[PDB]
């Protein structure tokens, strides 16, 4: 009776109509039987990657033994799993666990063939004694079978430290299934989840889940990553009745709450947002028609599901003269995709001027000084895979950064020294530059081609060239700066009353056509903010009472 | 005797009969026995490529010992295979000390064998190794031998470097037919005679990461492995070789043999599947590139130095991509450098390199460091006519010898490339004044060394339709996510031809133009409404634009 | 509290087994809340007898960690990582901060009489 308490039965649990249907994956049951039906070195082990199904092999073996559909020396056998977490528990009087497990092995010696030991997670018998060298002569006597299941790397990190153990082993690889086998497994599981949650499932919503979850998340393998969307959709549909069945809408809505990619359905509020977007983006960047239209179209294409899912959504570069809005525009698209000016990754490659700075955006090699930390660009996108990424002043980076930036493009995934891959399949890479500033389009593109790698341009999208500026354009910029200076004065509730001759006098002054729009910002505060700031701390500008501005030959009085 | 349950032995097992056939390689054994009987230095290391059979060399040495052919001064030695997985801290040296103590408890013939010792070499062995009570036969790899043993050395002056090398084809055939009578046991078939040499010959070409002794073991043993399914025909065949090598490399089984006439007579209308237009140009190139494969000219010149000039936007570089992917079997094996900056004396040195100590050195040459690796490339030269006359001496010995010197001092070989020297002058003169301008622009000697000066032309107004057909073919493949089709209409397909020529660039607006109107209007359609899956998408012309 | 005086060969694992028994004999009720579950990785010298309880849907286990302490311990342990979800909680805005701060005002007026 030495194992009646420390190990509950397993085949009798399957006989009482309990475990999962296991229809599919017939081959390696027959292969493990072909390994097992030998005279010596039976002792197999199921080894693969975590999640592709190793419970299901033993459950299917149990189902075939209960059904009696087995060959000759497998009929009416009883597989028994032993737990090494209740056997070790009460043992303190200097010898108890030793002779306890010895008596368990002695009772395993009693039956021949009918007993089959399946030790789950068999790297607990290497340690957890004070073990190993008490069952080790007992293995190669044909008494116990020792079927197990481990992870791929844990077998070669803990188990294979002793060579004299692998004589008592034989590896059995188990690969990940296909998409069609996932369709078959989902049709085979489509009875247990409708009884537990009393709702019915359309086969369209059954086929869309594994189809749609393959462009997205790749860290879990695919016998079960399609089960989770269906079960969460069943739970959400049970929530909504507290439209009575599931649909392909619900899979898309759950996966766009999960890992948080907003590539969901067409909710009707954002339809007028995406259509009327050139003016909504034109609320802060006034000017630059042909660039705003191109960026708007590259955003609009990826929402409709047209472009190839083997690239980023928009990976493009725009440049030109100085002070035009090339850094202003990237702050404007994230101000309505996110309504957050700080959810984007803005790194500056004007600091990577050496060959050994690449490690600060990819992470250190394992175990030197900072393998605890991790990278900077890599670890911030892996958590939320939707952020727009700037790259400011791509000139001054050493051209070994570009060797790492290359396989970001044209594949999607980026490796790191941690040992992983992070896939940038729907981010927006925006590259900025200030090359040349001495040609119209011939000389500056000649300098761009003289600065990069030759195919690095063809992998990009439309390389855009900006305009200059114009005296007609400059009035509304003054309107924006006056509105900003008014909204800055809204805490202490001051406001201004700006006359139209003053509003155009701000447009006559400050038109140096090589410095862009940035001298006007300085000129306004040289005119207005200094005089007001001198008056405000001298009394007489008590709050609420507004001030008008008036023209006086080169200043403007208040 | 107490370590044999923790270690192994291939001396007592050497009298079982578990040893392989020792066919071939009966000189390296003499080299090892010559190293082994000396006063110092008697610890050889076998240095070579992995997967060749250094283990088989040591097994053949033990098989020679158990019958006896070495002299009596090395009579009846015992050889131990070491368990290199038995320690992988706390074990990487702990069991190692007991093993070395049991070697110390010999005073005898317990000659060791450690495989891949460059991962195990720090200096705990050296006072015990240089004392002279053990003989350390080892096998390593060439590249890590320049990494581990030369900085962490401490005893590197106590080894001999026996080079094992790659086998020939016939020696591989002899070993492979020696290892033919083993596989009546795990698999059972009637072994075909010619399938052995067929599998070795077909594995010789395309497999690269594996090496010729067991590269012919990734064969036939695998060929009978998937033939286990037919007993769920008892002879293997060349198709049994072909369906393994074809369905592993993802390449269609068209060129299963004959790499000198097949796909040498295929240099034909399959160019027309990629190059629309320029019939006589395709004919002239197809003639000229197979004159070099007969072996009549000198062996050290470029395979084809032919060069052509005419308009832009024709196919002039579309022909270039069309022969890289066919003749070199690589999509990205072209090098397009532009000589549009080379007007000065300080600009030529960018395409060869700097001396060791100057400005551009780590990047190397602009030309040569992209030819040193992958020397199976087609090479273009855009816009030669603005180049300063100090390129043509560098460019001359390119097409006069098959050698050139780089910024370092190494040598590059141009004897298996293709040079193409393009330009854009001409295109208004038919044949006479264009060749006159060629003779006036260059020296007359520069044209005698070159091949044909074949002449391009414009495009037909009806033949320009099929380019737009191929662009619409590339269009519809992307929107298979919505599973749509697009029915194009031939009036609009005529309409895109006039507004997609612009006789200053050739025929280049089209990659932008097929995107712009069509894709943006249909993207607004799909995001708004009124179109679903399965839609044929009819297109037409509304007076000026192309409505839907 | 589990590791306190458990200085014998088997006391921690029998305490944990008693806790798992008093969770298992209930039907579906008790929802365990384990805050800072990077501590659940080691604590043995054991601590591995949670995988059969987790991979049967029998334990419920709501628990919160930080960001980097997740990848320092749990991403290092890629077999445990499958039997969990991830609910990414992000920072609120400034307007939602203002909406929060009108709710917590009564407690700060009670504790300090202002």
């Amino acid at each position: 009776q030495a194992l009646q308490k420390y190990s509950t039965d397993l085949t009798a649990r399957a006989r009482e109509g309990k475990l999962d249907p296991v229809i599919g994956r017939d081959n390696e049951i027959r292969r493990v039987v072909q390994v097992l039906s030998r005279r010596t070195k039976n002792n197999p082990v199921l080894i693969g990657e975590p999640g592709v199904g190793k419970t299901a092999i033993v459950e299917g073996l149990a189902q075939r033994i209960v059904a009696g559909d087995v060959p000759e020396s497998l009929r009416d056998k009883t597989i028994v799993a032993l737990d090494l977490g209740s056997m070790v528990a009460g043992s303190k009087y200097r010898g108890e666990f030793e002779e306890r497990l010895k008596a368990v092995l002695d009772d395993i010696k009693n039956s021949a063939g009918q007993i089959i030991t399946f030790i789950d997670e068999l790297h607990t018998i290497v340690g957890a004694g004070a073990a190993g060298n008490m069952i080790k002569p007992m293995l190669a006597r044909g008494e116990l079978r020792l079927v197990g299941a481990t992870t791929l790397d844990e077998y070669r990190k803990h188990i294979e430290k002793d060579a004299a153990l692998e004589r008592r082993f034989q590896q059995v690889y188990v690969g990940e299934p296909s998409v069609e086998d996932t369709i078959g497994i989902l049709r085979g599981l489509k009875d247990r989840y409708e009884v537990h949650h009393g709702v019915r499932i359309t086969d369209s919503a059954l086929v869309a889940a594994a189809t749609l979850s393959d462009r997205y998340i790749t860290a879990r393998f695919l016998p079960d990553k399609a089960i989770d969307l269906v079960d969460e959709a069943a739970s959400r549909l049970r929530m909504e009745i507290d439209k009575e069945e599931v649909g392909p809408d619900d899979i898309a809505d759950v996966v766009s709450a999960w890992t948080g990619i907003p590539a969901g359905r067409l909710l009707e509020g954002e339809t007028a947002k995406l259509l009327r977007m050139e003016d909504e983006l034109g609320k802060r960047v006034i000017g630059q028609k042909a660039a705003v239209t191109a960026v708007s179209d590259a955003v609009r294409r990826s929402r409709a599901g047209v472009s190839d899912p083997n690239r980023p959504t928009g990976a493009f570069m725009f440049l030109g003269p100085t002070g035009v809005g090339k850094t202003e525009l990237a702050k404007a698209l994230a101000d309505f995709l996110f309504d957050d000016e700080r959810a984007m990754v803005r790194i500056d490659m004007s600091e990577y001027g050496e060959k050994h700075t690449v490690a600060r955006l990819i992470g250190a090699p394992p175990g030197y000084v900072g393998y605890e930390a991790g990278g900077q660009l890599t670890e911030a996108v892996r958590r939320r895979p939707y952020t727009v990424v700037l790259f400011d002043e791509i000139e001054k980076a050493h051209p070994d950064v570009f060797d790492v930036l290359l396989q970001v493009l044209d594949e999607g995934r980026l490796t790191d020294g941690h040992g992983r891959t992070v896939d940038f399949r729907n981010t927006i890479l925006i590259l900025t530059s200030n090359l040349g500033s001495g040609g119209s389009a011939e000389q500056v593109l000649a300098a761009v081609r003289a600065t990069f790698k030759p195919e690095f341009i063809n992998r990009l999208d439309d390389v855009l060239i900006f305009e200059g500026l114009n005296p007609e354009e400059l009035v509304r910029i003054v309107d924006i700066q006056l509105a900003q200076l008014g909204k800055r004065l809204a805490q202490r509730r001051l406001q201004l009353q700006v006359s139209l001759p003053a509003k155009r006098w701000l447009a006559q002054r400050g038109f140096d056509p090589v410095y862009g729009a940035r001298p006007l910002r300085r000129l306004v505060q040289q005119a207005i903010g200094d005089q007001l700031a001198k008056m405000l701390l001298a009394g007489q500008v008590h709050d609420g009472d507004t001030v008008p501005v008036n023209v006086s030959p080169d200043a403007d009085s208040l | 005797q107490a370590l044999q349950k923790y270690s192994t032995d291939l001396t007592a097992r050497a009298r079982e009969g578990k040893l392989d056939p020792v066919i071939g390689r009966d000189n390296e054994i003499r080299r090892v026995v010559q190293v082994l009987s000396r006063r110092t230095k008697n610890n050889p290391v076998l240095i070579g490529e992995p997967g060749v059979g250094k283990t088989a060399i040591v097994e053949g040495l033990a098989q020679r010992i158990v019958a006896g052919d070495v002299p009596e001064s090395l009579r009846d030695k015992t050889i131990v295979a070491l368990d290199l997985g038995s320690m992988v801290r706390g074990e990487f040296e702990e069991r190692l000390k007991a093993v070395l103590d049991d070697i110390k408890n010999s005073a005898g013939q317990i000659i060791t064998f450690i495989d891949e010792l460059h991962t195990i070499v720090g200096n705990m062995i050296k006072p015990m190794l240089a004392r002279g009570e053990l003989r350390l036969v080892g096998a390593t790899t060439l590249d890590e031998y320049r990494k581990h043993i030369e900085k962490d050395a401490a005893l590197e002056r106590r080894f001999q470097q026996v080079y094992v090398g790659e086998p020939s084809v016939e020696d591989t055939i002899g070993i492979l037919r020696g290892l033919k009578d083993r596989y009546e046991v795990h698999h059972g078939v009637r072994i075909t005679d010619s399938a052995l040499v067929a599998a070795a010959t077909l594995s010789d070409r395309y497999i690269t990461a594996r090496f010729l002794p067991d590269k012919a073991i990734d064969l036939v043993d695998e060929a009978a492995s998937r033939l286990r399914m037919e007993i769920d025909k008892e002879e293997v065949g060349p198709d049994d070789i072909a369906d393994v090598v074809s369905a592993w490399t993802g390449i269609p089984a068209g060129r299963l043999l004959e790499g000198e006439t097949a796909k040498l007579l295929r240099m034909e209308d399959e160019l027309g599947k990629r190059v629309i237009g320029q019939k006589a140009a395709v004919t002239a190139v197809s003639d000229a590139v197979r004159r070099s494969r007969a072996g009549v000219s000198d062996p050290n010149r470029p395979t084809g130095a032919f060069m052509f000039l005419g308009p832009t936007g024709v196919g002039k570089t579309e022909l270039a991509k069309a022969l890289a992917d066919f003749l070199f079997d690589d999509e990205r094996a072209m090098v397009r450098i532009d000589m549009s900056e080379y007007g000065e004396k300080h600009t030529v040195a960018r395409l060869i390199g700097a001396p060791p100590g100057y400005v551009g050195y780590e990047a190397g040459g602009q030309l040569t460091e992209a030819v040193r690796r992958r020397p199976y490339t087609v090479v273009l030269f855009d816009e030669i006519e603005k180049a300063h006359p100090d390129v043509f001496d560098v460019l001359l010995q390119v097409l006069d010898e098959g050698r050139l010197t780089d910024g370092h001092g190494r040598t590059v070989d141009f004897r298996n490339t293709i040079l193409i020297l393009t330009s854009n002058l001409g295109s208004g003169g038919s044949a006479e004044q264009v060749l006159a301008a060629v003779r006036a622009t260059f020296k007359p000697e520069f044209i005698n060394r070159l091949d044909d000066v074949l002449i391009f032309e414009g495009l037909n107004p009806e033949e320009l339709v099929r380019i737009v057909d191929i662009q619409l073919a590339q269009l519809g493949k992307r929107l298979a996510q919505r599973r749509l089709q697009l029915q194009v209409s031939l009036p609009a397909k005529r309409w895109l031809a006039q507004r997609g020529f612009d006789p200053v660039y050739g025929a280049r607006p089209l990659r932008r133009l097929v995107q712009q109107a069509i894709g943006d209007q249909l993207a607004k359609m799909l995001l708004a409404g009124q179109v679903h899956d399965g839609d044929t998408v009819p297109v037409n012309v509304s007076p000026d634009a192309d409505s839907l | 509290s589990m590791v306190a005086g458990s200085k014998y060969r088997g006391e921690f694992e029998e305490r944990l087994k008693a806790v798992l028994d008093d969770i298992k004999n209930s039907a579906g009720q008790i929802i365990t809340f384990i805050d800072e579950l990077h501590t659940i990785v080691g604590a043995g010298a054991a601590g591995n007898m949670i995988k059969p309880m987790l991979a049967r849907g029998e334990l419920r286990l709501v628990g919160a960690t930080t960001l980097d302490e997740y990848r320092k311990h749990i991403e290092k342990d890629a077999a445990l990582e499958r039997r969990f979800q991830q609910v990414y909680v992000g920072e609120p805005s400034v307007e939602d901060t203002i909406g929060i701060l009108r709710g917590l005002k009564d407690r700060y007026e009670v504790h300090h009489g202002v």
Partner: peptide
């Protein structure tokens, strides 16, 4: 009857260093 008596450990992790390789600018 038998106590466990947990033990300590010591972990090592070194650091690389780079050379800068000046260029004579001609």
């Amino acid at each position: 009857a038998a106590a466990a008596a947990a033990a300590a450990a010591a972990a090592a992790a070194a650091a690389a260093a780079a050379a800068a390789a000046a260029a004579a600018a001609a």
